[PDB]
Amino acid sequence: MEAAHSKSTEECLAYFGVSETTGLTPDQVKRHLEKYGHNELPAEEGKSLWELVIEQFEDLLVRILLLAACISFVLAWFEEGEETITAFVEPFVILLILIANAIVGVWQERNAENAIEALKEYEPEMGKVYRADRKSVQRIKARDIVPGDIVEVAVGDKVPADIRILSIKSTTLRVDQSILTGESVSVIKHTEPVPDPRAVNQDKKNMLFSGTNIAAGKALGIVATTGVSTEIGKIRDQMAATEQDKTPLQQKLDEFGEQLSKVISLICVAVWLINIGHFNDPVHGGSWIRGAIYYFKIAVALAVAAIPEGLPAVITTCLALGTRRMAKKNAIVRSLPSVETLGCTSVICSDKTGTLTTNQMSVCKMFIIDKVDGDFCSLNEFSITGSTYAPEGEVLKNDKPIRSGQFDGLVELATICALCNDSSLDFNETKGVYEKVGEATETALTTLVEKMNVFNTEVRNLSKVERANACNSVIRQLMKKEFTLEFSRDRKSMSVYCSPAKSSRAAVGNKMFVKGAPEGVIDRCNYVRVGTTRVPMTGPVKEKILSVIKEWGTGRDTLRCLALATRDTPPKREEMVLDDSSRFMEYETDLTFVGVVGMLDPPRKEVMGSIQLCRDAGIRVIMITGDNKGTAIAICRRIGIFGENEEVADRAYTGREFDDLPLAEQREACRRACCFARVEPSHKSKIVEYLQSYDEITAMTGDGVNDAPALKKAEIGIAMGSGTAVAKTASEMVLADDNFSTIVAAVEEGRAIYNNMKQFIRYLISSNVGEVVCIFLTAALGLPEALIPVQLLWVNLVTDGLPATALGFNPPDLDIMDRPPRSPKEPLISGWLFFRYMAIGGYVGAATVGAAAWWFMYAEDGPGVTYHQLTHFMQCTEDHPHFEGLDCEIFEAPEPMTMALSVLVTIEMCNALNSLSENQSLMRMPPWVNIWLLGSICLSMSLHFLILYVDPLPMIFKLKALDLTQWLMVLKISLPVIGLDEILKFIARNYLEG
């Protein structure tokens, strides 16, 4: 049924042709069912195939390396008939690496999914219909409910479908709609058409929305829509139709992955282009190949050389590591790149109710009368700590602790609160939390009484289950509740008639205990209580009470206030008639004013600090709430989004106001404004979209189904653990404990993760630049190999790979949470950092060659050949005239090679230290700053001397121990890489940004 809300009860019955009295017929059911389907959602798209392992392979860095792993295989297979099948173990181990890395990826994806999933209860949910089968009610499963049928709901029921209320059986029906609309206080429903054409869900006061619950009352309705067509369904689709780019980190990597893809392609050319016209008289005939087409093959062999084999693993090790650090602070992260997103966020958008707030009505102030001396009236005002329904907290007066029991006025106040109450408390053993039973604004009082513990009852040993209503039980023992005078919109109050229970200390007073809107109640008071005594309601008293009430109702604390009284001398039960609520106002008169209670849906305690921390880190916070504007701002003020008496002129907008703006101005308003109230789920998203249109990286934080689309839209959606199931599946982060300060932590985490990466990318890559420059110098000068393909595979993956990993523990600067968020366009590697590590890669290249060469020509351990012999060693023959005294085998000596490897390592172990700080001298931050680095350094060297001295290794790696003076040379060559880098760091602090 379309817009049942705009119709009438009759128009709606008519439309389906049904009886409010009997309900649908099984034939009507049968049809209605086949026409509309089962009131439910489609099977969650939550089943990712193992071919989503092919999503772990969308990273240009793995793609790149997979090409270099298949270009190696296609350039390794059959390329020399005389090949021993043990040179293929590069592409093979590249496989086993990527296979693994692409898997530890999918591990966290489901490791996350079923942690988040662990947070849901129950198995099924159900409803209550009247069909023409039985004259009575029927507990039917929620799915089997169809449009058209007659449902009944009572306090505590979750509304099964979207329903058009037909008849309110209780005097008054209240609905908790916070999961859907963000509304702080349950909403009073009526049964009349909502004509309004611009009318929104929070205006459909004659409708009951699936997902929502009953705070009070009982009602009969007719199902308007079901499954996907509910307000719950619509938003579900809306959320799934929202598209998403890749994380900003993944984007930065793919941006880099393509910069690398360019240089690799630039080299394959450069070298090939430089030689094709020089292949003539090759002499290749025996070799059976076409050349300047085989020269190509060596060009790509250089390409593959430029790829840091070990990179995608260290990255995926850095992240996974940071994910696990967040999980100890109780943050489930769905995907690895997501642990960064927050580190570079410019704006955090945040929902209010249940996000910034607990959505648990709390009494935090209360007063009674202290003294009445003629024109003088003093009050006893108290405060209560606590922010949830949990009976945990203390009562203060003047900010220090009291026993409520010590004030008889507090004893009565407690008593009214216990007795004049249709609700209770309950501990949910499964979720491990206390929860309201009934109406939020009533349970606030239940909780308050438990905290107050007015009789000093021992409660220590009680299960949280038994403790929930303990103190209230004790009070309910003093007086039998004989009946209740239900609320009514005319007087806005209620009361209970109570006879004393045990004939002990009972003055026969059949008291009535009363509560309601303050001045309604106060105007019917003649006396006021002062301890156990009573006195006339003088005028200055009435002025004193009311002045404080107006205070509490406004400004700094914008509390919902409630006046409490008793009729000391109630009528007799006989002379009082109940079937007419219009009598009630009169029964509640001649009253004794007792006290007042102030309550609100309070901010979560961490929030305010968190919001300041963010601000100190250059991040805006914006509130987007479906709740009303007044409560929205009040809350913005308490938490610091706005200040004490700051003007929020054009800085706060409702949904209507915003929608009235022209699109150009809407986008503009999202730039200045920080409070949007009364918004639809759609707005929440549109606003994020608007912020993203300033190239701004934004987060979203929420709990209810109305945050879902906005949560899917943000670069990160953060969901509260106690939030709806939709909000969680749309988010990428989930605060299991609702601790808003994790956000401030998950962020500074994600700034450290970027810096470490950026750091160990500069380190690993200069390696492959050195390794490449060396293989190129060797071919251009015509010297023997200084380093072989395998010696490098090991260096890259292991020797280098560990110190790279232990860069992920570089102590984060303290200035880190002082700087703004990095600029969106600013790339990972700049044209300076490039030159910078290419100068390292440069030197490294030269040095390793120098090493092997210095041995051939000057080392006292190895015959000092001339540059000419070394350059023409291929022409060496059995005692050639030009190679006098030499053994041609000497050009394969393991000494120049051991000499060349050691220089690499010792420069990489050396340059690892240089990789401690982008610009801070090794003087400032010393070698010993990072300890987990020095651990790697020594383990690397340890595994070096291992390969040299461990029998089987020297042969398989083609190496031989180095003597002292030799190592003495290895160092002389490697140290200056420091002095070199040191010279670069100076350049980039005293001359550039200076």
Report what 627 binds from Na ion, Mg ion, ligand BEF, none; CB cut-off 5-8 Å by kind: ligand BEF
β partners of residue 382: 366
- According to CB under 6 A, which residues from 856 to 915 bind ligand BEF? none
Per-residue CA distances from 578 to 482, 499, 838 (Å): 12, 17, 91
- 771 annotated ligand-binding residue: yes
- The correct pick among 59, 157, 732, 800 for binding Na ion (CB under 5 A) is 732
Q: Which residue from 182, 343, 409, 709 is in contact with Mg ion, where contact means CB under 5 A?
A: 182
626's contact among Mg ion, ligand BEF, Na ion, none, with CB below 5 to 8 A by partner kind, is ligand BEF
For residue 683, which of 704, 707, 662, 699 has the smallest C-alpha distance?
707
β-strands 493-500, 512-516 pairing: antiparallel
Catalytic residue among 176, 254, 351, 707: 351
Known binding residue 878? Answer is no
- Consult the annotation and say whether 644 binds a ligand: no
- Rounded CA-CA distance 105/110 in Å is 9
Q: Answer with the entry of Mg ion, Na ion, ligand BEF, none that 717 interacts with (C-beta below 5 to 8 A by kind).
A: Na ion
Does 738 bind ligand BEF (CB under 6 A)? Our answer is: no
User: What is the number of other CB atoms lying within 10 angstroms of the CB of residue 703?
Assistant: 29
Return the exposure string of 6-22: e unless at least 16 CB atoms fall within 10 Å of the residue's CB, then b. ebebeebbebbebebee
Residue 703 binds Mg ion, judged by CB under 5 A: yes
Tell me which residue has its CB nearest to ligand BEF: 182
Q: By C-beta, is 40 or 689 nearer to Na ion?
A: 689
Euclidean distance between CA atoms 75 and 306, whole angstroms: 16
| Least spacing, CB of residue 201 vs ligand BEF, in Å | 12
Alpha-carbon span 963 to 874, nearest angstrom: 28
626 is in an annotated binding site: yes
Q: Return the residues of window 705-724 that contact Na ion according to CB under 5 A.
A: 717
The answer to whether 684 is a known ligand-binding residue is yes
879 is known as an active-site residue: no
354 in contact with Mg ion (CB under 5 A): yes
- Write out 515-576 in H/E/C secondary structure: EECHHHHHCCEEEEEECCEEEECCHHHHHHHHHHHHHHCCCCCCCEEEEEEEECCCCCCCCC
- Distance CA(840)–CA(422), nearest Å, equals 76
The DSSP code for 24 is B
Residues forming beta bridges with residue 176, ordered by sequence position:
213
Binding mask 351-370 for ligand BEF (x = CB under 6 A): xxxx----------------
- Nearest approach in angstroms of CB 65 to Na ion is 28
Compute the least distance from the CB of residue 351 to Mg ion, in Å: 4
Rg of the chain's alpha carbons, rounded to an integer?
Answer: 38
Counting beta carbons within 10 angstroms of the beta carbon of residue 173, is it exposed (0 to 12), middle (13 to 18) or buried (19 or more)?
Answer: buried
Tokens of 928: 């010993």
- Could you tell which of Mg ion, Na ion, ligand BEF, none binds residue 221, using a CB distance below 5 to 8 A set by kind? none
CB of 969 to Mg ion, least distance (A): 27
The residue range among 20-28, 78-86, 348-356, 802-810 that interacts with Mg ion, by the rule CB under 5 A, is: 348-356
211 binds Mg ion (CB under 5 A): no
List 59, 149, 152, 627, residue binding ligand BEF (CB under 6 A): 627
User: Stretches 117-125, 347-355, 392-400, 427-435: which one binds ligand BEF (CB under 6 A)?
Assistant: 347-355
Question: Binding string, 607-626, against ligand BEF, x = CB under 6 A?
Answer: ------------------xx
Binding to Na ion by CB under 5 A, coded x per residue (else -) over 641-680, reads ----------------------------------------
Structure tokens at 150: 């007659």
Residue 869 near which of Na ion, Mg ion, ligand BEF, none (CB within 5-8 Å, type-dependent): none
Toward Na ion, which CB reaches closer, 732 or 785?
Answer: 732
- The CA angle 69-940-796, to the nearest 5 degrees, is 15
What binding mask, one character per residue, do residues 132-171 give for ligand BEF by CB under 6 A, x or -? ----------------------------------------
Chain positions 653 to 712 lying near ligand BEF, rule: CB under 6 A, are: 704, 706
Give the residue from 420, 847, 789 showing the smallest Cα distance to 597: 420
Contact status: 59 vs Mg ion (CB under 5 A): no
> 695: alpha, beta or left, given left = phi > 0 and alpha = psi -120 to 50?
left
Q: Flag whether 353 is marked binding.
A: yes
326 binds, among Na ion, Mg ion, ligand BEF, none (CB under 5 to 8 A by kind): none
Q: How far apart are CA 493 and CA 490, in angstroms?
A: 9
Identity of the residue, 447 or 706, whose beta carbon is nearer to ligand BEF in the bound complex:
706
560 annotated ligand binder: yes
Alpha helices in 43-142 (DSSP H): 60-73, 89-116
Q: Where are the beta strands (DSSP E) in 290-361?
A: 331-333, 347-350
- Reduced DSSP (H G I as helix, E B as strand, rest coil) percent helix, strand, coil of the chain, to 5: 45, 15, 40
Torsion of CA 751, 757, 762, 765, to 10 degrees: -160
Tell me which stretch binds Na ion (CB under 5 A): 291-299, 412-420, 730-738, 811-819: 730-738
* Residues β-bridged to residue 654: 677
Q: Which partner, Mg ion, Na ion, ligand BEF, none, binds residue 681 by CB below 5 to 8 Å per kind?
A: none
CA distance 885 to 178: 93
Q: Which of helix, strand or coil describes residue 262?
A: helix
678 annotated binding-site participant: yes
The answer to whether the annotation marks 305 as part of a ligand binding site is yes
Q: Given the rule CB under 6 A, which of 106-114, 224-232, 239-247, 348-356 is the region that contacts ligand BEF?
A: 348-356
Closest CB to ligand BEF among residues 357, 729: 357
Secondary structure in 3-state letters for 750-806: HHHHHHHHHHHHHHHHHHHHHHHHHHHHHHHHCCCCCCCHHHHHHHHHHHHHHHHHC
* Nearest-angstrom CA–CA distance, 578 and 877: 122
666 binds, among ligand BEF, Mg ion, Na ion, none (CB under 5 to 8 A by kind): none
Asked if residue 598 binds ligand BEF (CB under 6 A), the reply is no
Inter-residue contact 530 to 558 (CB < 8 Å): no
Smallest gap from residue 715 Cβ to Na ion (A): 7
Q: Do the beta carbons of residue 394 and residue 364 sit within 8 Å? A: no
Question: Measured from the CB of residue 70, what is the shortest distance to Na ion in angstroms?
Answer: 34
* In the complex, minimum distance from the CB of residue 713 to ligand BEF, in angstroms, rounded to a whole number: 15
Q: Is 304 annotated as a binding residue?
A: yes
What is d(CA 847, CA 850) in angstroms, rounded to the nearest whole number?
A: 5
Residues marked active site are found at 351
Interacting residue ranges for Na ion, rule: CB under 5 A? 717, 732
Interacting residue ranges for ligand BEF, rule: CB under 6 A? 182, 351-354, 625-627, 704, 706
Please give the annotated binding residues, written as ranges.
304-305, 307, 309, 351, 353, 442, 489, 515, 560, 625-627, 678, 684, 703, 706, 768, 771, 796, 799-800, 908
Interacting residue ranges for Mg ion, rule: CB under 5 A? 182, 304, 351, 353-354, 703-704
Please give the annotated binding residues for ATP, written as ranges.
353, 442, 489, 515, 560, 625-627, 678, 684, 706
Please give the annotated binding residues for Mg(2+), written as ranges.
351, 353, 703
